[PDB]
Amino acid sequence: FIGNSTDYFKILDHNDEFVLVGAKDVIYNVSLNGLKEIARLEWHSTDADRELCALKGKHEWDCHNYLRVYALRPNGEVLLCGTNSYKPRCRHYTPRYEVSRDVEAQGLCPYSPAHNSTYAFADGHLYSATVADFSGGDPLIYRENLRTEQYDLKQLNQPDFVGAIERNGYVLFFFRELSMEVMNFGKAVYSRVARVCKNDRGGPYSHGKSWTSFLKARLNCSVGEFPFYFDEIQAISPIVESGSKSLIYAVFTTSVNAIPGSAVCAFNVDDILAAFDGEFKSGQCVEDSRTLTSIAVNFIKNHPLMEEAVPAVHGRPLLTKVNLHHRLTAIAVHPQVKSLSGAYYDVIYSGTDDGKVTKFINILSTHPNSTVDRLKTVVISEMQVLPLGTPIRELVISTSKNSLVVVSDGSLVSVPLHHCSHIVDCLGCLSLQDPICAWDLQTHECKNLATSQHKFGTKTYLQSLNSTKKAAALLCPH
Amino acid sequence: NSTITNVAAFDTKLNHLLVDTITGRVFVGGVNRLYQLSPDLELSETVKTGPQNDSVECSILDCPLAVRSPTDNYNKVLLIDRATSRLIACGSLFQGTCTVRNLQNVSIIEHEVPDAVVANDANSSTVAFIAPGPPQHPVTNVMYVGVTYTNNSPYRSEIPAVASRSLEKTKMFQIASSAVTTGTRTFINSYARETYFVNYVYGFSSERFSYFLTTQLKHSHHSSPKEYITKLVRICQEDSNYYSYTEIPVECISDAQGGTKFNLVQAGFLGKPSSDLAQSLGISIQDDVLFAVFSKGEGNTPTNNSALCIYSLKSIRRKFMQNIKSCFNGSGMRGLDFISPSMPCVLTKLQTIGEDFCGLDVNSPLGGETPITSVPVAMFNTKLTSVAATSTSGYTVVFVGTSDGFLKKVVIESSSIANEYASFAVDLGSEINRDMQFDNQNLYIYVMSKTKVSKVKVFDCSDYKTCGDCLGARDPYCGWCSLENKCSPRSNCQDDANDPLYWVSYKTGKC
Ligand SMILES: *[C@@H]1O[C@H](CO)[C@@H](O[C@@H]2O[C@H](CO)[C@@H](O[C@@H]3O[C@H](CO)[C@@H](O)[C@H](O[C@H]4O[C@H](CO)[C@@H](O)[C@H](O)[C@@H]4O)[C@@H]3O)[C@H](O)[C@H]2NC(C)=O)[C@H](O)[C@H]1NC(C)=O
Ligand SMILES: *[C@@H]1O[C@H](CO)[C@@H](O[C@@H]2O[C@H](CO)[C@@H](O[C@@H]3O[C@H](CO)[C@@H](O)[C@H](O)[C@@H]3O)[C@H](O)[C@H]2NC(C)=O)[C@H](O)[C@H]1NC(C)=O
Ligand SMILES: *[C@@H]1O[C@H](CO)[C@@H](O)[C@H](O)[C@H]1NC(C)=O
Ligand SMILES: *[C@@H]1O[C@H](CO)[C@@H](O)[C@H](O)[C@H]1NC(C)=O
Ligand SMILES: *[C@@H]1O[C@H](CO)[C@@H](O)[C@H](O)[C@H]1NC(C)=O
């Protein structure tokens, strides 16, 4: 599904059947069946509003109405907001559609089409994380009648938001920020997870317009005696239910003018919330936050940062790419793919800034070469999806259609989620090491175990994941 | 003494002084006290405002687990509303509370607000004047307030540094216009709030703009040594977002001892020029002139080395425009790093930035670096603490108060030529307050020291018996009629004499 390079696509909603794409002056409703346009809603900035934008020092390619917030309201109404040439507006479309409300959107919708902002429409309320000023120096996290402290750098210091998750009566915000936490900070960037209660109603008297529950914690995506940190978070995934554990997968990278490198980490949702229960660095949801004391609300506004850092699953990155030419930029996971032995493996898809998608799993071999358990990365495939230079912005998985939608700035491409049908050679089927593809010996076809039925006591199917890739091939006779 | 008419001695230390422009009644705000007087300094009413139980750690509603103790109530604001006859007085207690009292009888309280509005310190500045503003288009007046961060309570962060405040009965003393991301308000950021303090000296309104005369550190970061400068804070009065919040520095520079900078301003007064002075400045006689006294300071402490400097508001407006034009052309840094981190000025297609420029979203909180500069018309060996200017005579005479209690008169004939013609003590050993106001006819001037107020006559030509004494006094108010043996101004002589030398000035002729 191709458009110009000038527009800037942003997945604003995704189902297994349809996806909504906000672009330069329109929003598309696209079928995942064939990436075919199903519906369109055009909304162009008025010539006076976009002459005002170029007047204030912007270019032609900046002064457009980039659609960047979507939400279907519980009444059938449609909430739709756009940058409107650095003058963000929100509209209420009601049924096709017809305009029913138009109003300013400062603090509800970014000014710039950059992937700087995020939001979460949780329980009929929009939680927004963006800038509220044309100059981009007033970051905030805003809900109906509640915002963070304006220009308070201890709460937000030049942040770039990468995602927002709803969870258990909180709303989590994922972003990278400037470091003023350490007394000897020197323009360092650290990645945070923030939290606000959904039943927050502001503090008493003058605090009635500000959060009484904003807390943040640093994310730890480090590699031993010689630590190696990936401090700039780039993309997150939705919450993934891997068995009994809820996990969030994230892509991290090193800072500029540092050893270039990318990593993928995963954090348990329970570990994220547990960090907000430890010490503060020098939050519970009460039914009426307007009953708190001035002492308590002023405290949390002066200690919004937790002491402990959220640790990573397995205590290390699941994949690392250091000193390579490309950087990782997006993440998506197919959870709990049952292998031939009956083990469940999450299959991880991570796109690079030059249009590749890496597929891999992790195996936790218990005492294979030492007494401490050793985690290993099994890379299934690293193929080129987009043209050689184009950055992959997002990934959307459709486990139903066995399709992976790759999102660039001006296109959507779909590829197979699992390549079992494509391969026809025994060596290829075992060297692939996909937890879902296994080589049959009665039938010569490399088969997909989602539709097949093994029985644990039959030598029919053949699969090798723990070994090396050449060792999997030796299992093939002749 | 015959030059001093009435003297009123008060029991407490006095903080402020204003005169009703139509009734000439005198209002005096002091420590634990509040007085109303007649135009002849006869006491009408007196109000006990303190002491009361209060702690700086506590607000009115809550007192954290800290005890309230009897503390003095320093008067910080004294103002009159003309549309609705009512006096506004703000005290230091209870996080800086204002009361609204009746103008006929100050003992009557009409409205008591709990809002924290004013500095709760005894020495932290607070400047307040009433002028047109929002919410409505400029038919309603608002209160522009500027408060220093006293740094003694958590409740102090809530109070803005510069803000417009409503005078509506429904929304008394609330910020005039406020929205989600913007409003009639400027705060100092959490990182500079406790270290970068702002001293507000004088406030005034002129030609659709509100102004503040401030002393403050030139730089927020610690990369440079501490230098104190005088700044000028401006906001468009139509502006309900403070998009027009702008500052330029104010320099009063002298030739003496190589380079001499009088960096610390002590007092300000807005007034009109004379025929001769308006020609020098290149302004009309109806235009405004800012009179201010600057003192060279060792750090933040003013020394006994002051100077008198005048600024025309045509050159103030043209200097603001000069700093704004330059930013909107992309040159330099926006400034005001102590509000938010200073980002570069943006290049803009703006084609008609003039003197009335009222602000936009872009380059909004602008800190000018190009100062308005003036050479003082007079310098002094004492610390000057007040200033007032009248042009009842054909010449402008500037009244200057001393920290030692002296009153001096300077006559300003040009932007280059000025000199003292009178000097005498009003209250010896007692610093003259900054609030120094004239009578409605500009015939008497009210001089307030630590504990007294003195009604001083502006001129007295009758006490010059002979004529060499009349012209020798070099008083611009005094001439000498040829016929009658009286020293008196021109209007007092009768032009019935055939010779035009009937009334002669002190420099135009010889007696
Ligand atoms: C998130 O978790 C990871 C892993 O759990 C963690 O990485 C660990 O960091 C610590 C310190 O940053 C590393 O500890 C080092 O261990 C060696 C011994 O092998 C010590 O020598 C190190 O310094 C000590 O001794 C030095 C002797 O010269 C002294 O100079 C120094 O002052 C110290 O006394 C130090 O203890 C540890 O090896 C890594 N572990 C791994 C697996 O990488 C990371 O720090 C965590 N992040 C956050 C934000 O908490
Ligand atoms: C993108 O376009 C597709 C196709 O036009 C939209 O899907 C359609 O959505 C409507 C409205 O929800 C569905 O109608 C509803 O059907 C249910 C099921 O019977 C019924 O109970 C409701 O009363 C209503 O009639 C319609 O069936 C559905 N069509 C398909 C093929 O799925 C889709 O909603 C659009 N995207 C978004 C974000 O709305
Ligand atoms: C509070 O005021 C009372 C008068 O009602 C006074 O007796 C008391 O001493 C004050 N509190 C303190 C701690 O002094
Ligand atoms: C002024 O107010 C006080 C206090 O209410 C009252 O005692 C007095 O009688 C009033 N009028 C005059 C003329 O003093
Ligand atoms: C306030 O100023 C006066 C006069 O300068 C001084 O005597 C007093 O100690 C000061 N108070 C404080 C708390 O600095």
Author numbering:
A (entry chain B): 53 to 147, 165 to 292, 294 to 352, 374 to 569
B (entry chain A): 62 to 126, 128 to 573
Study authors write:
Semaphorin ligands interact with plexin receptors to contribute to functions in the development of myriad tissues including neurite guidance and synaptic organisation within the nervous system. Cell‐attached semaphorins interact in trans with plexins on opposing cells, but also in cis on the same cell. We have discovered a distinct mode of interaction through which the Drosophila semaphorin Sema1b and mouse Sema6A mediate binding in cis to their cognate plexin receptors. Sema1a and Sema1b are most closely related to the mammalian class 6 semaphorins and interact with the sole Drosophila class A plexin, PlexA.
John Wiley & Sons, LtdIn the crystal of 2:2 complex, two pairs of 1:1 complexes are packed together in the asymmetric unit with a relative orientation of 168.8° to form a pseudo tetramer. Each Sema1b molecule binds to both PlexA molecules in the pseudo tetramer. There are therefore two independent interaction sites, A and B, involving two different Sema1b‐PlexA orientations. The first, head‐to‐head orientation is equivalent to that observed in the 1:1 complex (interaction site A). In the second interaction mode, termed side‐on, Sema1b1‐2 and PlexA1‐4 bind through the site B or B’ with their carboxy‐terminal PSI domains oriented in parallel. While the B interaction site is extensive, the B’ interaction site is formed through distant contacts between three residues only. The structure of individual Sema1b1‐2 and PlexA1‐4 molecules in the 2:2 complex is very similar to those observed in the 1:1 complex, showing no significant conformational changes with the exception of the Exβ1‐β2 loop in the extrusion of Sema1b1‐2, which adopts a different orientation in order to avoid steric clashes with PlexA1‐4. In the side‐on orientation, the sema domains of Sema1b1‐2 and PlexA1‐4 are bound in a configuration in which the bottom face of PlexA1‐4 is oriented perpendicularly to the side edge of Sema1b1‐2. The most prominent, site 1, is formed by the extrusion of Sema1b and blade 6 of PlexA. The Exβ1‐β2 and β4B‐β4C loops are involved in semaphorin homodimerisation; however, for Sema1b1‐2 in the 2:2 complex these loops mediate interaction with PlexA suggesting that a B‐type interaction can only be mediated by a monomeric semaphorin molecule.
